[PDB]
Amino acid sequence: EEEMRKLEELVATTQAALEKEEKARKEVEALNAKLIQEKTDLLRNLEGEKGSISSIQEKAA
Amino acid sequence: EEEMRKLEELVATTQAALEKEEKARKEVEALNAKLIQEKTDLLRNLEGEKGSISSIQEKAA
Q: Going by C-beta distance under 8 Å and a sequence separation of 6 or more, which residues neighbour residue A17?
């Protein structure tokens, strides 16, 4: 009466784990890669504008 | 015993699955924990500057 219950718990632990791995393996680079590109285009906009604010200071003196 | 042999192999993959499941999530929560504040205060940094750049040029012209 006990041989049936270990087989249904056997297939349940594998299908529940299998949907959990590839859900996590997808989102780790999905969040990281779109965050590292959006700082790179803003930083060259930043230091080029920080060079532009001193230009109005040297031209006025 | 052969019936306990079929039980223990896929659980060994599942115990290897759960440790890799928690490994991916705890590194992706800590990187988002400080970086979303990084994009907010630079927005005040840029707009507080470019609002002045629109204001410094009209009296310099």
A: B13, B14, B17, B18, B21
Instruction: Tell me the resolution in Å.
Output: 4.2
Given a contact cutoff of 8 angstroms between Cβ atoms, the answer to whether A3 and B4 are in contact is: no
Task: Tell which of B7, B26, B27, B50 to mutate to test the A interface (max A CBs under 10 Å).
Answer: B7
Cβ atoms within 10 Å of A17's Cβ, excluding its own: 19
User: Can you give the length of chain A in residues?
Assistant: 61
Place of tokens 């060259």: A44
In degrees, to the nearest 5, what angle opens at C-alpha B13 toward C-alphas B26 and B15? 45
Output Rg (C-alpha) for chain A, integer angstroms: 28
Name which of B3, B21, B60 is nearest A56 (Cβ-Cβ).
B60
